Amino acid sequence: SQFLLELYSRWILTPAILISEVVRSLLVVSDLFTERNQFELMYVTLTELRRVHPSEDEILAQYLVPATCKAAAVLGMDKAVAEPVSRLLESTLRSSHLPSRVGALHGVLYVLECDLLDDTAKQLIPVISDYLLSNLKGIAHCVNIHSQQH
Amino acid sequence: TKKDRVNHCLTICENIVAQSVRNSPEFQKLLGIAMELFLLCSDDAESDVRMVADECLNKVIKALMDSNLPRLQLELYKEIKKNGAPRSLRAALWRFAELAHLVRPQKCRPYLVNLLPCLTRTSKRPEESVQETLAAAVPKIMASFGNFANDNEIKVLLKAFIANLKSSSPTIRRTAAGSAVSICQHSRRTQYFYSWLLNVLLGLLVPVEDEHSTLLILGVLLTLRYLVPLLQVSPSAEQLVQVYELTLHHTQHQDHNVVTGALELLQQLFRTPPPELLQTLTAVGGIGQLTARIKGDIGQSTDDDSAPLVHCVRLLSASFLLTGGKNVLVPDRDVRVSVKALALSCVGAAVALHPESFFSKLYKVPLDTTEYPEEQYVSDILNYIDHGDPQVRGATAILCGTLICSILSRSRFHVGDWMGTIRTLTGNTFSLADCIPLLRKTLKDESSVTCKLACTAVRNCVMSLCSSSYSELGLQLIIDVLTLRNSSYWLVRTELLETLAEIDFRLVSFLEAKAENLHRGAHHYTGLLKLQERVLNNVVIHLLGDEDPRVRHVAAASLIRLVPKLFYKCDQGQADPVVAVARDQSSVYLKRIYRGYNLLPSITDVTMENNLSRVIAAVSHELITSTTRALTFGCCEALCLLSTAFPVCIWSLGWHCGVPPLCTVGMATMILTLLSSAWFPLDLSAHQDALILAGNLLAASAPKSLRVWPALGDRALVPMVEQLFSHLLKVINICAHVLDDVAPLGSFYHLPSYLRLHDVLKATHANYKVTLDLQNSTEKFGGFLRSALDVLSQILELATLQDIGKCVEEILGYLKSCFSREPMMATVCVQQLLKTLFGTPGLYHYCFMAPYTHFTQALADASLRLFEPLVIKALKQYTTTTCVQLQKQVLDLLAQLVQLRVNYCLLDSDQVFIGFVLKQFEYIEVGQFRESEAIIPNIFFFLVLLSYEIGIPKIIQLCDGIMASGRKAVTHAIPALQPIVHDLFVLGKELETQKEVVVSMLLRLIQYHQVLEMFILVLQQCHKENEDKWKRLSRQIADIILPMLAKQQMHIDSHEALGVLNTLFEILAPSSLRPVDMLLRSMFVTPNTMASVSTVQLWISGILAILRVLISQSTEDIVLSRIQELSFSPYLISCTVINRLRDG
């Protein structure tokens, strides 16, 4: 797992076909990172991408919102880390891409899971609380129509 | 006097046009003298003088193309013979090619003889600026002065230009090459002069092992890039194979200007090949039957056991772009990257012809296993995706497009079985799993020149995969082009939408339901992969809202190509996506009111009315809920191109939204509020498309509403028609005050909203009168004046005499000023006013059970006067015009003054107009007339209808000349009789003799299937007039056509052609078909040779149309008693007899 951190950073920092499938291989092995040295290198490569890679690449948009959010949970959810992580979850829930809606909601959990979260950033749980009320009243009667794993 | 010289030239110009007196013996002398003086103003060398006084000479001509054309063109021929200065002779030569198609064919033959002494001197001139404009006039002059010369005059002219291939200037070499090839399109015999230029040039390169003066080697290869587009006694099949071996020696002859000359000649002979040359290369033996840096045995193009296109890919690779030892690039130092670019585009156009070349070994005899470890195949061509610049990674982007296009069409989508045969023959390991990820990568490339060439590779390649076994990988390339919709190069976005117009989105919706991992794809998405609503809302309607006028026009034509191909879910026809693909491939393989509107019951497809009502739902939504200037402006251009392919009157249930709630008025209430704003009409590029679309939506109410404006009969519909008829008389009121320089019911003075429309029609009219260019489709005043006389026509049909009786004064004044600019559709405004001033389903249904029962149901039936100033002006135009779109609308204006009985006083004393129609029959038989095709159906309707008042004895002698002494029949002779037969057989002793004459002429012409529609009219009157005469005439054409069907003289090449001949045997009398002696000797026949699909195709149409008679007209009992007497052996076409004909 140390040999795979060196390889996938030099490709990011490659064609647009290979941009999307490299962010997805790094989120799966994340079960097996065994050191606090190893989780710190993961969060650094993913934030230099978003400011450089275009925002309208919605295949690439839905693998990285699961990727950037599981780093900041093992890491401290601190004031220099909350303001980059909290802003990215609000926008992708407004996206029209319905499998991009689903990857961004797993990133809510790990932030909400264990760390005693910052007091100003937990006032942005009513950002994520408001999205849940709107899509149950439409999927109360009919569930066969809308989706299954959304 | 340099500022004194400027004021002199400009005051002569205005005092000729403002004379308003022409054809006068005082006015003739004045125009000759000061016309040569306009060019001395240009001959004097100052850019303040040369620019100013050349735009002023164009003000004279265009205001005088109507009045004095024979006076203009006589002063102008004088200056070329003067052979003046190279600046003086040049700008006169622009003027003379644009007025070549304005001459009359009466005076044309004197103009041809005088130019060939004048056109050879300007070919001998070494001025590189004088030689350029002649390659932009010998296209235009000898296409209108083409047909008037014999075989003597045109052989002299082509020996001169080849002596202009012997010069060393690159500007003078390419102007003598486009002059030889523009004549042979128009010479006298278009096919005889193609074979004559190929004999002259190959003696300039007769045997190639000589010294050929390498400037003169480049002269012969540039005349051949212009003529191979035209090759598709004739140019022989052995004449064209001498062209092809000449170039492969010249891809090796070292230079950089001679290597690049024979590589543009090879890229174009595979794209548009001549069909004689095209069969000799795909063939296995190939050239062997016609005769009876590289370091290996390639095997030349004479060898058998391999096609020559297997040979021609081995040769262009090891010399230019590949080294025979290892997968390695060749350096750019050795071969230029302008020379490596044209060699990747020639390997791709041959795979579309012979796809077995790309899998071959590079050397036939292997090359020295001591030096090199392994030998390689031609797959290192596909390692030039990483090579540097655009147009090499982009021209190996296009080498993988047509390698996938042409294996699927070669072996019929059997990528399993066809790849097995090659691998044991040439042992390469190259599947199509290793080329689509090479094509997925160049779509994501950086440079915007690299992205234009990789998206034409998906125009060829995603209609063949998606219906093949590799259609897992075929759907992914639909997905990635959708990310290419927002790149900022305007040529990158318009070759996307052509590969999203050629998509069949009913076959694309079928693969989505079968996918389970492809819906996820990358990053494991949840939900459906909705291609169709994402490619129609977020590209095609979205690219209507682009800033460019180039990008907005191309997106409309795709919604003409998308609407038959949608498949929205759960129609009341096609249910599944399985049943959707099955109905577009069964129609293929199993079978006077104005132009706006319709009165039929209008039989229509129920499920094709559903796909056209979802594309007018999302299009009226980015026109009302839009926030930009650019969304409102280029989506009135996408609604005017639906209504000219999917008209509103035929498809009204798709266009219907609301109004009259039931034959519809769809969506026409929004668009009048666009026009009544003072913002939207101020630009003529899309105000002319909002007037052709508001007349299509008030005419579809005509089958319903008709029983102020008393004929409308629907008071919720009258303010929509009150507005446009108020809107179209104020736009012929601003076009009348512009064509005549006059200061500013229909009145735009007191409106400040339409004083803004007077400054916009005056910017587009100062560029026409100053810049002479006659043949432009898009002019934006000449395009705008075409739009507002088309829709003033369509409303008058709804009007009556009582509404127009206060306006017949009004609309006739404007057209006298609106006559000269566009008279073609200013009589279409006059043709209509006189009408209304004188009153006038589940995949068993579709594949079998619905087409099986149209078969058996047609067999049981087989067992069965303010116009007087305006009318006189339109007759002076027909004698002096030359455009034959205007000559067709003037023969319909005179067939309406004789039906509506206007007395024959248009020619009060003489017979001036009727004498001129007889002379035009002299120019068609000989062929000295340019566009006789679009006038010969309407010349003959005017003549027969006057004789009820030239008599029908004289009318039928003119038609006999065209047929036997003149051109072919399907343009001239067969449309000549459609006016006569319908007006003689349908509508005492003098009338009996003339019916015997017309039936004898068609027997000489039975061979054509348009002549068999005229003869279904003849048999239906004899069953009504006299049934004794009905049976005599069906026996005479019984023993003519059945001797033709055995010798295959009957042109049944079309499916328009088999439909006409089967309604003939129903209506032919059954007494003439009752002996089965005749129908069987015409049936059981063998053709001459079945080698060619011109001859295989007419023998199997004689067997399908005499077999519709042995099933209905005679039962089973009668047929088989006869063949016991007639020894018709069953070895007639047997497997021994069919084998010797395809070869023979």
mmCIF file of N, CA and C in Angstrom, chain B residues 856-913:
data_model
loop_
_atom_site.group_PDB
_atom_site.id
_atom_site.type_symbol
_atom_site.label_atom_id
_atom_site.label_comp_id
_atom_site.label_asym_id
_atom_site.label_seq_id
_atom_site.Cartn_x
_atom_site.Cartn_y
_atom_site.Cartn_z
ATOM 1 N N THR B 856 -52.551 -9.784 -49.907
ATOM 2 C CA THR B 856 -53.685 -10.578 -50.369
ATOM 3 C C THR B 856 -54.931 -9.739 -50.596
ATOM 4 N N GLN B 857 -54.909 -8.454 -50.248
ATOM 5 C CA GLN B 857 -56.103 -7.637 -50.404
ATOM 6 C C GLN B 857 -56.081 -6.894 -51.730
ATOM 7 N N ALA B 858 -54.898 -6.671 -52.302
ATOM 8 C CA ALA B 858 -54.814 -6.117 -53.645
ATOM 9 C C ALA B 858 -54.741 -7.203 -54.706
ATOM 10 N N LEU B 859 -55.089 -8.443 -54.356
ATOM 11 C CA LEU B 859 -55.216 -9.500 -55.357
ATOM 12 C C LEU B 859 -56.674 -9.807 -55.668
ATOM 13 N N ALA B 860 -57.550 -9.717 -54.664
ATOM 14 C CA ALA B 860 -58.981 -9.863 -54.895
ATOM 15 C C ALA B 860 -59.534 -8.703 -55.711
ATOM 16 N N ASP B 861 -58.922 -7.526 -55.590
ATOM 17 C CA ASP B 861 -59.207 -6.401 -56.463
ATOM 18 C C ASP B 861 -58.568 -6.566 -57.830
ATOM 19 N N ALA B 862 -57.593 -7.463 -57.951
ATOM 20 C CA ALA B 862 -57.043 -7.817 -59.246
ATOM 21 C C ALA B 862 -57.848 -8.917 -59.911
ATOM 22 N N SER B 863 -58.800 -9.510 -59.196
ATOM 23 C CA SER B 863 -59.801 -10.343 -59.847
ATOM 24 C C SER B 863 -60.929 -9.494 -60.421
ATOM 25 N N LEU B 864 -60.962 -8.207 -60.080
ATOM 26 C CA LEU B 864 -61.959 -7.288 -60.609
ATOM 27 C C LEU B 864 -61.581 -6.849 -62.018
ATOM 28 N N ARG B 865 -59.142 46.189 -64.010
ATOM 29 C CA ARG B 865 -57.845 45.727 -64.485
ATOM 30 C C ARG B 865 -56.734 46.706 -64.162
ATOM 31 N N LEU B 866 -56.367 46.758 -62.887
ATOM 32 C CA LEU B 866 -55.168 47.454 -62.441
ATOM 33 C C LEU B 866 -53.908 46.638 -62.674
ATOM 34 N N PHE B 867 -54.049 45.396 -63.138
ATOM 35 C CA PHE B 867 -52.934 44.527 -63.483
ATOM 36 C C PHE B 867 -52.288 44.908 -64.804
ATOM 37 N N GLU B 868 -53.022 45.601 -65.680
ATOM 38 C CA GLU B 868 -52.558 45.975 -67.018
ATOM 39 C C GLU B 868 -51.244 46.760 -67.042
ATOM 40 N N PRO B 869 -50.925 47.657 -66.076
ATOM 41 C CA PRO B 869 -49.529 48.097 -66.000
ATOM 42 C C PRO B 869 -48.597 47.014 -65.474
ATOM 43 N N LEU B 870 -49.059 46.138 -64.580
ATOM 44 C CA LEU B 870 -48.136 45.170 -63.995
ATOM 45 C C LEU B 870 -47.992 43.926 -64.869
ATOM 46 N N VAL B 871 -48.990 43.602 -65.694
ATOM 47 C CA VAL B 871 -48.905 42.377 -66.496
ATOM 48 C C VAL B 871 -48.003 42.579 -67.711
ATOM 49 N N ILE B 872 -47.956 43.797 -68.253
ATOM 50 C CA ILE B 872 -47.148 44.052 -69.446
ATOM 51 C C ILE B 872 -45.655 44.009 -69.111
ATOM 52 N N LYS B 873 -45.301 44.279 -67.857
ATOM 53 C CA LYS B 873 -43.891 44.315 -67.479
ATOM 54 C C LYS B 873 -43.309 42.909 -67.340
ATOM 55 N N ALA B 874 -44.151 41.909 -67.089
ATOM 56 C CA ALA B 874 -43.635 40.568 -66.823
ATOM 57 C C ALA B 874 -43.347 39.818 -68.113
ATOM 58 N N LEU B 875 -43.802 40.342 -69.247
ATOM 59 C CA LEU B 875 -43.594 39.647 -70.516
ATOM 60 C C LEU B 875 -42.299 40.097 -71.179
ATOM 61 N N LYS B 876 -41.835 41.302 -70.857
ATOM 62 C CA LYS B 876 -40.551 41.778 -71.366
ATOM 63 C C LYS B 876 -39.392 41.097 -70.656
ATOM 64 N N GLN B 877 -39.672 40.446 -69.530
ATOM 65 C CA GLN B 877 -38.632 39.820 -68.729
ATOM 66 C C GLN B 877 -38.304 38.427 -69.244
ATOM 67 N N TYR B 878 -39.311 37.714 -69.749
ATOM 68 C CA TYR B 878 -39.148 36.337 -70.187
ATOM 69 C C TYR B 878 -38.325 36.236 -71.462
ATOM 70 N N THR B 879 -38.391 37.249 -72.318
ATOM 71 C CA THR B 879 -37.591 37.254 -73.530
ATOM 72 C C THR B 879 -36.131 37.584 -73.264
ATOM 73 N N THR B 880 -35.824 38.220 -72.136
ATOM 74 C CA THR B 880 -34.490 38.740 -71.878
ATOM 75 C C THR B 880 -33.812 38.142 -70.659
ATOM 76 N N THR B 881 -34.486 37.283 -69.902
ATOM 77 C CA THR B 881 -33.819 36.681 -68.758
ATOM 78 C C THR B 881 -33.076 35.420 -69.169
ATOM 79 N N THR B 882 -32.330 34.870 -68.219
ATOM 80 C CA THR B 882 -31.636 33.617 -68.458
ATOM 81 C C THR B 882 -31.780 32.628 -67.308
ATOM 82 N N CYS B 883 -32.094 33.071 -66.089
ATOM 83 C CA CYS B 883 -32.303 32.144 -64.984
ATOM 84 C C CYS B 883 -33.628 31.415 -65.157
ATOM 85 N N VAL B 884 -33.593 30.088 -65.021
ATOM 86 C CA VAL B 884 -34.736 29.277 -65.425
ATOM 87 C C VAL B 884 -35.587 28.928 -64.205
ATOM 88 N N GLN B 885 -35.282 29.531 -63.060
ATOM 89 C CA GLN B 885 -36.284 29.565 -62.003
ATOM 90 C C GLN B 885 -37.301 30.663 -62.269
ATOM 91 N N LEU B 886 -36.897 31.716 -62.986
ATOM 92 C CA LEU B 886 -37.844 32.777 -63.320
ATOM 93 C C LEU B 886 -38.641 32.433 -64.566
ATOM 94 N N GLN B 887 -38.131 31.560 -65.427
ATOM 95 C CA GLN B 887 -38.897 31.255 -66.636
ATOM 96 C C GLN B 887 -40.028 30.278 -66.345
ATOM 97 N N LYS B 888 -40.026 29.664 -65.164
ATOM 98 C CA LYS B 888 -41.040 28.667 -64.840
ATOM 99 C C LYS B 888 -42.251 29.306 -64.175
ATOM 100 N N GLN B 889 -42.063 30.421 -63.471
ATOM 101 C CA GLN B 889 -43.200 31.040 -62.797
ATOM 102 C C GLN B 889 -43.935 32.014 -63.705
ATOM 103 N N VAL B 890 -43.471 32.193 -64.941
ATOM 104 C CA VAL B 890 -44.143 33.081 -65.881
ATOM 105 C C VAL B 890 -44.996 32.265 -66.844
ATOM 106 N N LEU B 891 -44.766 30.960 -66.926
ATOM 107 C CA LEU B 891 -45.662 30.137 -67.724
ATOM 108 C C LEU B 891 -46.844 29.637 -66.905
ATOM 109 N N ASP B 892 -46.855 29.888 -65.597
ATOM 110 C CA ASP B 892 -48.055 29.597 -64.821
ATOM 111 C C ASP B 892 -48.923 30.832 -64.637
ATOM 112 N N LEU B 893 -48.393 32.020 -64.903
ATOM 113 C CA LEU B 893 -49.187 33.234 -64.778
ATOM 114 C C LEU B 893 -50.054 33.430 -66.011
ATOM 115 N N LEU B 894 -49.728 32.734 -67.095
ATOM 116 C CA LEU B 894 -50.469 32.894 -68.336
ATOM 117 C C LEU B 894 -51.409 31.724 -68.583
ATOM 118 N N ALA B 895 -51.298 30.656 -67.805
ATOM 119 C CA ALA B 895 -52.286 29.588 -67.887
ATOM 120 C C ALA B 895 -53.470 29.880 -66.980
ATOM 121 N N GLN B 896 -53.431 31.013 -66.288
ATOM 122 C CA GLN B 896 -54.499 31.398 -65.385
ATOM 123 C C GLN B 896 -55.291 32.572 -65.955
ATOM 124 N N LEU B 897 -54.719 33.263 -66.938
ATOM 125 C CA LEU B 897 -55.431 34.336 -67.618
ATOM 126 C C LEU B 897 -56.256 33.789 -68.776
ATOM 127 N N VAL B 898 -56.125 32.496 -69.062
ATOM 128 C CA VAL B 898 -56.892 31.902 -70.141
ATOM 129 C C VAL B 898 -58.018 31.045 -69.573
ATOM 130 N N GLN B 899 -57.779 30.409 -68.420
ATOM 131 C CA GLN B 899 -58.859 29.742 -67.700
ATOM 132 C C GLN B 899 -59.860 30.755 -67.177
ATOM 133 N N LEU B 900 -59.407 31.670 -66.333
ATOM 134 C CA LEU B 900 -60.173 32.861 -66.007
ATOM 135 C C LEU B 900 -60.106 33.750 -67.239
ATOM 136 N N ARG B 901 -61.205 33.824 -67.987
ATOM 137 C CA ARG B 901 -61.145 34.260 -69.380
ATOM 138 C C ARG B 901 -60.838 35.741 -69.537
ATOM 139 N N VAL B 902 -59.578 36.108 -69.334
ATOM 140 C CA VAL B 902 -59.046 37.384 -69.789
ATOM 141 C C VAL B 902 -58.855 37.282 -71.292
ATOM 142 N N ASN B 903 -59.475 38.205 -72.029
ATOM 143 C CA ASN B 903 -59.418 38.227 -73.485
ATOM 144 C C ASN B 903 -57.982 38.413 -73.953
ATOM 145 N N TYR B 904 -57.672 37.837 -75.115
ATOM 146 C CA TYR B 904 -56.298 37.768 -75.612
ATOM 147 C C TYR B 904 -55.893 39.139 -76.165
ATOM 148 N N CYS B 905 -55.732 40.079 -75.236
ATOM 149 C CA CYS B 905 -55.367 41.457 -75.507
ATOM 150 C C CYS B 905 -54.070 41.842 -74.823
ATOM 151 N N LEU B 906 -53.318 40.859 -74.325
ATOM 152 C CA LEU B 906 -51.991 41.123 -73.784
ATOM 153 C C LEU B 906 -51.032 41.507 -74.903
ATOM 154 N N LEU B 907 -51.335 41.067 -76.122
ATOM 155 C CA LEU B 907 -50.563 41.319 -77.323
ATOM 156 C C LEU B 907 -51.370 42.073 -78.368
ATOM 157 N N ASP B 908 -51.943 43.226 -78.000
ATOM 158 C CA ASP B 908 -53.042 43.948 -78.657
ATOM 159 C C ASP B 908 -53.059 43.978 -80.188
ATOM 160 N N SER B 909 -51.908 44.202 -80.825
ATOM 161 C CA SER B 909 -51.867 44.191 -82.286
ATOM 162 C C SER B 909 -51.245 42.902 -82.821
ATOM 163 N N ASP B 910 -50.027 42.591 -82.387
ATOM 164 C CA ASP B 910 -49.190 41.552 -82.968
ATOM 165 C C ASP B 910 -49.387 40.219 -82.238
ATOM 166 N N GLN B 911 -48.458 39.286 -82.448
ATOM 167 C CA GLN B 911 -48.406 38.018 -81.726
ATOM 168 C C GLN B 911 -46.990 37.848 -81.154
ATOM 169 N N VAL B 912 -46.538 38.898 -80.454
ATOM 170 C CA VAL B 912 -45.144 39.048 -80.036
ATOM 171 C C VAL B 912 -44.726 37.949 -79.069
ATOM 172 N N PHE B 913 -45.562 37.622 -78.084
ATOM 173 C CA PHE B 913 -45.129 36.665 -77.071
ATOM 174 C C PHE B 913 -45.250 35.230 -77.562
#
